[PDB]
Amino acid sequence: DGVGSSSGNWHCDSTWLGDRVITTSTRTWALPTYNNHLYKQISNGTSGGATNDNTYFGYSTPWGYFDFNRFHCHFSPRDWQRLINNNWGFRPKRLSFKLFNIQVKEVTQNEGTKTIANNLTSTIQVFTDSEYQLPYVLGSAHQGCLPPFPADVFMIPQYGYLTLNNGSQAVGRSSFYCLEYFPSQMLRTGNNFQFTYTFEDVPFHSSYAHSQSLDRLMNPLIDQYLYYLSRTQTTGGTANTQTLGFSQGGPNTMANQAKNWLPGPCYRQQRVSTTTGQNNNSNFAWTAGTKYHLNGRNSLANPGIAMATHKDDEERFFPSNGILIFGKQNAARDNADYSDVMLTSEEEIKTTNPVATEEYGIVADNLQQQNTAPQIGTVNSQGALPGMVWQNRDVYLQGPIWAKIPHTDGNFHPSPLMGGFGLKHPPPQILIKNTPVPADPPTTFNQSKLNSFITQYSTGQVSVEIEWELQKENSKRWNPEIQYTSNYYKSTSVDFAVNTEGVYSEPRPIGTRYLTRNL
């Protein structure tokens, strides 16, 4: 381990071995000094115009962190295509992480003149929250992950966290965490860091779409032996009185047939069209938003439980806050136009999951008698019911991979709503920080903590290797399947490539459900 010796090589590749695929990606990173080496209490109350739904109390820290919770951090577009076009499923098995070729640079600023040089003896500090003692900030769809394109140099995100709050104030249970309290490895140029991790057992992601629907599992050609109430009143003319008539469900009465299952849970969202002219002329994104109520404040149930984005022929419709939406390259942070973002679609699950913008179904609302007509009620919120079956939200090339399951007494189907794998012991948080280097101190002793430091930052490479287990497709479907494919005809540029300006871009969201499977 010396100044003149590399401490690691560039490992970027993918190998397919059978029921496994191993991805490996390396990137060059840059880490500045955050918070001026300080920890700062940050808060936001209800003063000014800040609403109560957005209050918070927490801290910003001088630390940065590595994040690769995004599929494109590991799969190239072509690899993603190889995965989704041929496998009914897949899942993470184990990973290796490495930090190397570290270099700490210090910048001198005198008379407009700026010079940067190495500080051969400075160190960075690194450690993993292997015992999950820090607030788990990963799994919240934050920016700062390794770039999709291998040639892009990225900046390391700053670590910050939240605790309990009451307005802009802290409460008795509010917790303060000092990351310097943890043992951490100190590396100088020449030193490297690495660790291994094994994923817990988790189900394969459903990278397939159903080629059958819950309400169409019977034999088209045979009647049931079971009967259903088919008539409640006579029909012979005008002397119509009450009676009781029963019939057997059959090919023409599939909606009446007795069935064994029920569609998945529902939490109805407001519908909105991509054809603005068809929408009400008001600003309802928030006022008509589907939300949950937690201790006084409201949050969008975004994207909320997995529901079909729209029913047959209505591609223009989508749940106001019930789908993942990515931005196109350079889309504005605020009020970006529809043509600057990319809406995803969980259309593939219409097959088992209720459509996100409609009722779950209908229930009786009273007791009918001869003097009281029967009444019905529309169900727009339907929790788990015995016999329900459903699918989870799909995952995307540019979407999240996993999330830490909250440590609670209970929960229900812990599949992270934004999509992905829910893990009790997810990949550990990897914290990194440039060690503060005092600028000359006074010549006579003083109690005060130093606050004058040499200006510096660090850079180096990072590698992440993940082994994935594949669940091969075993279909007897005779006719060809749907497959993700590149466009055929000429185009100004190549999809999933760089610009004349060297800018890489992801033209569209790529899901995972192309192959089909029976129910």
Binding site for a copy of itself (CB under 8 A): 1-6, 8-13, 18, 24, 26, 28, 30-34, 76, 82, 85-86, 101, 103, 120-123, 125, 127, 178, 180-191, 435-438, 440-444, 450
State the nearest-atom distance from the C-beta of 489 to Na ion, in Å. Answer: 12
Which is closer to Na ion, CB of 81 or CB of 321? Answer: 81
Choose among 122, 100, 117: nearest CA to 1: 100
If the CB atoms of residues 200 and 495 are measured against Na ion, the closer one turns out to be 495
Considering the complex, what minimum distance in angstroms separates the CB of residue 308 from a copy of itself?
Answer: 41
The CB-side HSE value for 224 (13 A sphere, CA atoms) comes to 20
Binding mask 430-469 for Na ion (x = CB under 5 A): ----------------------------------------
**247 a known binding residue?**
no
Tokens of 317: 């419709």
Q: For residue 456, give the 3-state DSSP assignment.
A: strand
Query: Which one of a copy of itself, Na ion, none is in contact with 144 (Cβ closer than 5 to 8 A by kind)?
Result: none
The verdict on 279 binding Na ion (CB under 5 A) reads no
- Print burial letters for 326-336: b (CB count within 10 Å at least 16), e (below 16): beeeeeeeeee
Quick one: which segment of 103-111, 145-153, 288-296, 489-497 binds Na ion (CB under 5 A)?
489-497
Residue 71 burial (10 A CB sphere; 0-12, 13-18, 19+): buried
Calculate the CA 316 to chain-centre distance.
23
Region of 157-165, 176-184, 463-471, 481-489 interacting with Na ion (CB under 5 A): 481-489
Q: What is the largest CA-CA distance in the chain?
A: 111
CA torsion 398-404-410-413 (nearest 10°) is: 30
Residue 517 binds what, of Na ion, a copy of itself, none (CB under 5 to 8 Å, by partner type)? none
Please classify residue 307 by burial: count the beta carbons closer than 10 Å to its beta carbon, then call 0-12 exposed, 13-18 middle and 19+ buried: buried
Q: Which is nearer to a copy of itself, 82 or 105 (CB)?
A: 82
The one of a copy of itself, Na ion, none whose footprint includes residue 513, by CB under 5 to 8 A per kind, is: none
Rounded least distance, CB 105 to a copy of itself, Å: 14
In this complex, which beta carbon is closest to Na ion, that of residue 379 or of residue 498?
498
Residues 6 or more apart in contact with residue 398 via CB below 8 angstroms: 70, 71, 72, 148, 326, 506, 509, 510
The reply to whether 495 sits near Na ion by the rule CB under 5 A is yes
Q: Which is nearer to a copy of itself, 129 or 469 (CB)?
A: 129
86 vs 435 by CB, closer to Na ion: 86
Any contact of residue 494 with Na ion (CB under 5 A)?
Answer: no
Residue 415 annotated as part of some ligand binding site: yes
Report helix, strand or coil for 181: helix
How far lies 243's CA from each of 231, 370, 464, 504, in Å?
7, 12, 71, 71
Site for Na ion contains 493 (CB under 5 A): no
Q: Which residues pair with 60 in a beta bridge?
A: 40, 160
CB 262 → a copy of itself: shortest distance, Å?
31
Q: Does 486 bind Na ion (CB under 5 A)?
A: yes
Binding site residues for AMP, as ranges?
A: 415, 422
Residues that bind Na ion (CB under 5 A): 486, 495
Binding site residues, as ranges?
A: 415, 422
